[PDB]
Design a protein around this ligand. Structure first.
Ligand SMILES: Cc1[nH]nc2c1[C@](c1cc(-c3cccc(CCC(=O)O)c3)cc(C(F)(F)F)c1)(C(C)C)C(C#N)=C(N)O2
Ligand SMILES: Cc1[nH]nc2c1[C@](c1cc(-c3cccc(CCC(=O)O)c3)cc(C(F)(F)F)c1)(C(C)C)C(C#N)=C(N)O2
Ligand SMILES: Cc1ncc(COP(=O)(O)O)c(CNCC(=O)O)c1O
Ligand SMILES: Cc1ncc(COP(=O)(O)O)c(CNCC(=O)O)c1O
Ligand SMILES: [Cl-]
Lengths: 442, 442
């Protein structure tokens, strides 16, 4: 007693908006540093009937039976996760149930410190995540600043993690956990120095590697698994999996961590796992462990170096004057335009990017930059040669943004009225559309 | 630069376990009160490319642009949610972003009361959810007992919510929130009396209607929207959507609740929404608001009445001696077998059900019952006359369980060696497999 007509037949209204969404994805230069594009197989998993099954608990310790095939999938996902990140299952455990990055982080933090526990993370404005303790004078914006007592450490005036400040803060503050690994940080991390500071105060080392996961797995960047107690990562960004997350824990350094983490995830925070997700993560994690995916990750860094270099060749400034990874932050101060203006200008030409703070911005009220990244376009087949066009397209957008601001004024409402029906934007948009539409699309 | 080979080719190992899972679902009498079967259209949405898009924030106020089509989908979902539950968008709002039921409950509770806040809910062992404040002497098992101060109210010795106890507890405890609507409660809820008790102490009324959502939407059971401040519900149980959740908030009774709930969901707890989920939820809510779906829901209650009646005709005892909804709790005390023994026996014959506490069990250590429900089998096409066969099968499972306990003893490890190779079970399984396999399967 159900309706099995296809999606197009059952709901024509939704099917159009979805077909529209797909066209816009195909015809966009996607430089969102956190986005990627899943293959058809990962998307077969996400729509599988395995999401019908309730399986609260852990493998061989479920609350319900009938979880034999689910238990194999969940055990296969865990095994593949450990192989991908070059860790022995004797020394490391992994929880694969967290529904997303933020949930994983709050669960892992709670496991380690509990309510009223003390944590340290990078400030939002300096490239830290919301779940690293973010707050403001006006409110405790993240639950990680409310259910915990958090203190926030800044990057220096050149945009680098200031280690002497991390130490200074830790010795006064004496937190149980210090979070490293960031959302918009363009350089690699000195995990060893973090491990040295943690020991000095007896705090846990938390490495959130969501943005750089593929680089850690494929050994292109430093390995926090050598120094870290806990490693969290999303599976949807550079790793190219479904929207999910992983919590890694170091048994050898912390006997008894396995139970606290597992109990934090269920039944402290979550209920039933989303088995379609776990299936999909298994499917991608097999791809992560091939040499073909290493080729892909290498290309992400090759594109990102090329892109930063080409942007500097057009006299555009970058925070830290370069990148060690997939992402660049563009400092827009020399043009006297804001990040939100360029984001509007770039949406108007089918270029996907986000506004982003820079070290000079005291506040988060007006970010002076945009953040961009190569994983999405590297997935779509762009090589080092293609990055000169993207830098070209971004340079033109900055110039048009400066023209429009001159004509209509620096207020955002006044700025925007200039956008629709702009001859150059329509021309640039058609240019963006013609190249992007051609590219391989999974 | 991606591998577009189909799931079967790209990963044969996972694909076989998934084809196995599908076969087991097709050949199981699924009586899990919380499970259902999504149609193909809902599963087309869950695997849609819309899950590629990051879209933190809310519609028309996203952090990123490029969210035009996502915003229509998310606006279409909230609209369809308010229409489904017979509420005016002037008086009621809905957040569609929570990833699952437990997340929705923790976020909504945080919005209302904050950290250290006071909440009241039904005890786990009496049919309340984990996220209703569940703790034990030993541990604060749920975050809702830890990030909040919770007190737990029990049902009476006949399995009914004891209102006199709820009121007595509220006047001593003085919580900010009182939770009603449960996981294993076989009767309807007197929300009006709950709303009368909340006013008297000045606490908010929280209705978690995850198990009975289709009954509220279709006007078969009492309507908590007449009385409640907040209504949460999952979309994957009787409602038959994807794995997701909804927080409803009553704007008229509480000005400014809209922002508090929206900010609790993001940026307090979550980050990026899962747009494939929201698409899928949108798609199913169209089906929910149809006369065809109401026919289905009515059939769920008809099958459940019939099933309770047939079980009583075979001298099997039901908690509260019946049901007003989709679910029945069988009390197994007269046979001297435990719920977990029958769960193993029932898994051994492809009958999916769960072990469940009853009123007599002071401790959760040994649940003396099983919980069962009709939504899944009603979806597969069973009618009232089919319920005698399910009651026959369950009676036979209880008897075989008594036989096996006789032979091998009442200790659990001993009990299970009797199960594999048991001639009657192989015979009963074969009976189960032959009937279930034939039924319509979405
Ligand atoms: C949306 C989001 N999630 N996590 C992030 C951000 C992000 C961000 C968050 C926010 C953000 C999000 C939610 C809440 C707040 C608090 C300030 C407010 O209430 O407006 C800021 C703002 C920005 C902006 F300043 F550029 F507008 C940027 C980026 C990646 C979009 C950010 C930065 N900068 C960092 N570090 O991390
Ligand atoms: C698994 C789960 N999730 N939410 C539930 C349950 C559920 C439940 C939870 C639990 C449960 C889950 C997690 C943690 C605990 C604490 C006990 C322990 O640590 O051993 C109990 C146990 C049962 C059992 F007693 F029957 F085995 C049952 C049912 C639906 C499976 C329950 C009951 N009774 C209620 N009310 O709600
Ligand atoms: C370091 C880090 N950790 C956790 C998360 C949270 O993931 P969910 O969105 O799955 O909750 C993000 C997302 N950051 C958003 C961005 O970079 O665009 C992140 O950058
Ligand atoms: C009343 C209630 N609320 C919330 C949830 C949580 O849903 P998630 O699993 O999506 O977090 C459940 C699930 N209860 C499990 C069952 O009855 O089988 C529930 O019964
Ligand atoms: Cl999903």
């Amino acid at each position: 007693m159900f309706n099995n007509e296809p999606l197009e037949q059952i709901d024509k209204e939704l099917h159009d908006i979805l077909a529209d969404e797909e066209k816009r994805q195909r015809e966009t230069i996607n430089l969102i540093a956190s986005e990627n594009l899943t293959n058809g197989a990962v998307r077969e998993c996400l729509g599988n009937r395995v999401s019908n099954k309730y399986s609260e608990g852990y493998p061989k310790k479920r609350y319900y039976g009938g979880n034999d095939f689910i238990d194999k999938i969940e055990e296969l996902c865990q095994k593949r996760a450990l192989e991908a990140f070059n860790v022995s299952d004797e020394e490391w455990g992994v929880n694969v149930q967290p529904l997303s990055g933020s949930a994983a982080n709050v669960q892992a933090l709670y496991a380690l410190v509990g309510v009223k526990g003390k944590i340290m993370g990078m400030h939002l404005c300096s490239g830290g995540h919301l779940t690293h303790g973010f707050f403001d004078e006006k409110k405790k914006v993240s639950i990680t600043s409310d259910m915990f007592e958090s203190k926030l450490y800044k990057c220096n005036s050149q945009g680098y993690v200031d280690l002497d400040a991390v130490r200074e803060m830790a010795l006064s503050f004496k937190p149980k956990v210090i979070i490293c690994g960031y959302t918009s940080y363009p350089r690699d991390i000195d995990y060893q120095q973090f491990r040295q500071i943690c020991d000095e105060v007896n705090a846990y080392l938390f490495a959130d590697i969501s943005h750089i996961s593929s680089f850690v797995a494929c050994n292109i960047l430093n390995n926090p698994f050598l120094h870290a107690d806990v490693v969290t990562t999303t599976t949807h960004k550079i790793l190219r999996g479904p929207r999910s997350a992983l919590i890694f824990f170091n048994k050898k350094r912390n006997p008894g961590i396995e139970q606290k983490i597992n109990s934090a995830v269920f039944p402290s925070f979550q209920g039933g796992p989303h088995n379609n997700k776990i299936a999909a993560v298994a499917c991608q994690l097999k791809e992560v462990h091939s040499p073909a995916f290493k080729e892909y990750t290498q290309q992400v860094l090759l594109n990102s170096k090329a892109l930063a270099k080409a942007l500097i060749s057009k006299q555009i400034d970058l925070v830290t004057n370069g990148t060690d990874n997939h992402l660049i932050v563009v400092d827009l101060r020399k043009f006297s335009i804001t990040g939100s203006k360029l984001q509007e200008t770039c949406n108007a030409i089918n270029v996907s990017l986000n506004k982003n703070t820079i070290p000079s911005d005291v506040d988060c009220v007006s970010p002076s930059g945009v953040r961009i990244g190569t994983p999405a376009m590297t997935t779509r087949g762009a090589k080092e040669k293609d990055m000169e066009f993207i830098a070209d397209v971004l340079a033109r957008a900055i110039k048009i943004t400066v023209d429009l601001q001159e004509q209509y004024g620096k207020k955002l409402v006044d700025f925007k009225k200039g956008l629709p029906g702009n001859a150059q934007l329509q021309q640039l948009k058609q240019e963006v559309v013609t190249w992007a539409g051609a590219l391989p699309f999974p």
